[PDB]
Each structure stands twice: as C-alpha cells, then as structure tokens.
C-alpha cells in the first residue's frame, strides 16, 4: 500500500551538502503530515524536523538549527531535506515516516507517526569509498545430511555500508543467513550470506550474487563454480 | 522536555511487564508508543491510552495516571522482543522529544546449539593476495560467545581479528569471525581448522589438509 521511497546518502566530507529525497506512493500527497526523524546505531532515535499536510514547516531540534532545510512538492509529490555543514556528530538512519490523522484545520497540535520507511545510511567522515570485492566461495563435497552443503560471497573492502544482495533478479525470499558486517579495525567492513543450496543436479540457481553499492558502482555479474 | 526511561527490563512470559515513561508535568497531553524490532521497521501500538491500530491485538495497552505512562504487555512470547518507544509532543518547545528505548527480553527460553561453518578459499583468488578466510557461526540464543581460532593446529590470536558482538536475527544471536594473518600460503600442513568456545559444549570443525 504505502511505499514511502527514500533516496539519497552516502560518504560524504565534514562541511559539505547533500539532498535527501522522500517519495510517496498509495496515499493523496495534500492531506497527511511527513517527518525526518534519524536513528542513530544502537543509540535510540531522534527527530529531525517534519513538514504538514500543506507547506508548512513545524519546527527542528536544538542542534539542526540553521543547518538543514526542508521543503515539500505537492506537484511531484515528494519531501526534499537539504543539509549543510555536516559534522562528525550526524551519522545516523534518516527515516521518513508518515502521520496517521488528516490534520483539520482546528484541532490540537499533535503529531505521530503512523507508517515508516528503511532509511539511508548517510555517514559523514574522512574517509573514502572502497570497491567491493565479491568472491566466489568453494561449496566443498562435505555431503553428510540432505543440504549441508552452502555457498555465499565474500564482499569486502568497503567503508559504507548500502548491503543490498540479490541472487537472479530480487526473488528466493526463503531462508538466507545474511551475516551483519564489522569494522576490522581499519574502517573496511565483510558480508556474507549462507543459502540452502541443495544437491546440485543441474536442479539449483545460477550461482549469481549481485551486491548494489551506491556510493561504488559496479555492476558485479561473476559467477559461483565449485 | 526530557522523558526517563528504564535502559532493560526483562520478564518471564508468564506474566505482563512494565515500561513507564514519565516527566515533569505530564498529565494531560498525549503519549504515543510505538515498538521497532531489531533490524525491521518499527509499527504502531497502542497510543494516546484509549485505542488501538487496525491489526495491534487487545495484548497491548497503556495507561496514564498523573505523571507516569505505562504500556503493558499482556501474554509476552518470544516473538515479542523489540525496542519500545515513548514519544510526547511537548508544545511549549514545538519539538518531538524521544528517549532511550527499552531492550523487552523474554528471561527463561530454552537453549539452541549453534552450529559452526567452514569456507574454505575461493578457487580464483590465489594468484593475488586476498587472505579473507573466514568462519561463520549459526544462530543461537545464549550470547557472548568468543571464538577460538586454531590456526595451524596451534592457538594463534596475535592477529588482526574482527570479533564482531552477536547481532539480532529473527529473535536469535549471530555472529562472525575472521583471521587470515597467514602469509597467504595458508595450505601448509597440519590441517588449518576453526573452533568456537561457548558456554558449556564448545564446537570444531576442520578442513582438507590441501
């Protein structure tokens, strides 16, 4: 039904500026209130700022004052947020969530969320963007049960982190053990992934594991081969 | 404003919890609660202490009384480990102010035994010098696992490892583990293995001496 889609992040130098994009799908784009509310790591959320049914801008925090803007389109249906003088401090999950009440013209001002959205991952350091390195890893001939055997990618070598994996064209939701990454003591980060993989008698995928990085494109189409 | 919260609360699922929020003078205007699980996108509960979302059982709940917002859980499952937040409007600063989730943990499930895996190499990558090797471990309930590596049959931890926390899987702990301080010639003999201490029964597994 609702398909709030977000775009916009990645590795970004202290002190520059970026556009933050949330589109919406299912709903009338005039009639319902859409906030920014970040998500630090671990580190609970926190409110960003937010824009009414119409233009109307609502209010920011204590530390987003003077630096962020934001502005909604009615024509294209969409909320932009623009942020300037990014600082080491600003490295959280930028959500776009939704409201719930039509907002009448009289009432009593308050606000809450009602759908949200995934979130980019908009890190701001020093550093920068390392290619991904995908490997083909060996699915050894230790057969014991029925699928003991499995086969993943070795992705490595990349500071942010977008991990977005697709085997043939973004279906076989069944189960798949995607292992979360780790800083390795020198700000690169490692996927992996664990499939079924069940006896191969020409029967099983094509052995493709396609990882999309944004801020390092590369289209990766290499094969698996025991 | 500023709301305080409490940083863990656990409870067997036997019986109901207590998540409060409370304030200064918090006693008449609205307190919403919503729960976001470990990796998911967080949902809508209970809000405003009288009504619910379309989908949101009657096991959920809140009430206010003075000064304290609580949510009560009613029949707590496995399933229902997530992070709960209050959030407050607070119109004298026209701000959103949020606060520290709590971590609901169902104390008193049963054991699972996690399972350890072996990758061995890729085939095309010995021409260059990667020395990516790494050993995966399966879910499990019991954390705060430390993985032992036995590096040429031998205990070898001067290397650089990861050693990465256990992480949130459909309500169970995972985790990783990789050393490769080998200088890439990592088939010498003795059978390079991996093992994984946990508490109680610790795990191994070995490769092909090649």
């Known amino acids: 039904e609702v398909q709030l889609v977000e775009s916009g992040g990645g590795l970004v130098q202290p002190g520059r500026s970026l556009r933050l994009s949330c589109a919406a799908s299912g709903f009338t784009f005039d009639d319902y209130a859409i906030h920014w509310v970040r998500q630090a790591p671990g580190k609970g959320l926190e409110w960003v700022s937010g824009?009414?049914?119409?233009?109307?801008?609502?209010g920011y925090a204590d530390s987003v004052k003077g630096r962020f803007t934001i502005s909604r389109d009615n024509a294209k249906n969409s909320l932009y947020l623009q942020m300037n003088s990014l600082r080491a401090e600003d490295t959280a999950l930028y959500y776009c969530?939704?409201?719930?009440?039509?907002?009448?013209?009289?009432?009593?001002?308050?606000?809450?969320?009602?759908?949200w959205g995934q979130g980019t991952l908009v890190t701001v350091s020093s550093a920068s963007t390392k290619g991904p390195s995908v490997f083909p890893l060996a699915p050894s001939s230790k057969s014991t049960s029925g699928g003991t055997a499995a086969l993943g990618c070795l992705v490595k070598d990349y500071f942010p982190e977008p991990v977005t994996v697709s085997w043939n064209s973004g279906a076989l939701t069944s189960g798949v053990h995607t292992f979360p990454a780790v800083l390795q003591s020198s700000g690169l980060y490692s996927l992996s992934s664990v499939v079924t993989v069940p006896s191969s008698s020409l029967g099983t995928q094509t052995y493709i594991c396609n990882v999309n990085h944004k801020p390092s494109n590369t289209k990766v189409d290499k094969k698996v081969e025991p | 404003y500023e709301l305080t919260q409490p940083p863990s609360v656990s409870v067997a699922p036997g019986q109901t919890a207590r998540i409060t929020c409370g304030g200064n003078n918090i006693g008449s205007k609205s307190v919403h609660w919503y729960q976001q699980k470990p990796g998911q996108a967080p949902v809508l509960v209970v809000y405003?202490?009288?009504d619910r979302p379309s989908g949101i059982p009657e096991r959920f709940s809140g009430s206010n009384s003075g000064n304290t917002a609580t949510l009560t859980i009613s029949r707590v499952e496995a399933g229902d480990e997530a992070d709960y937040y209050c959030?407050?409007?607070?119109?004298?600063?026209?701000?959103?102010?949020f606060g520290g989730g709590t971590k609901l943990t169902a104390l008193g499930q049963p054991k699972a035994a996690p399972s350890v895996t072996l990758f061995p190499p890729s085939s095309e990558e010995l021409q260059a010098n990667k020395a990516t090797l790494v050993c995966l471990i399966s879910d499990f309930y019991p954390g705060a696992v430390t993985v032992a590596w036995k590096a040429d049959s031998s205990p070898v931890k001067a290397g650089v490892e990861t050693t990465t926390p256990s992480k949130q899987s459909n309500n169970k702990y995972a985790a990783s583990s990789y050393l490769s301080l080998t200088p890439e010639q990592w088939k010498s003999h003795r059978s390079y293995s991996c093992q994984v201490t946990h508490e109680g029964s610790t795990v191994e597994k070995t490769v092909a001496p090649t």
């Open positions: 969530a939704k409201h719930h009440q039509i907002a009448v013209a009289g009432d009593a001002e308050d606000y809450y969320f009602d759908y």
């Open positions: 824009i009414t049914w119409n233009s109307g801008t609502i």
């Open positions: 405003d202490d009288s």
């Open positions: 959030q407050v409007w607070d119109s004298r600063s026209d701000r959103v102010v």
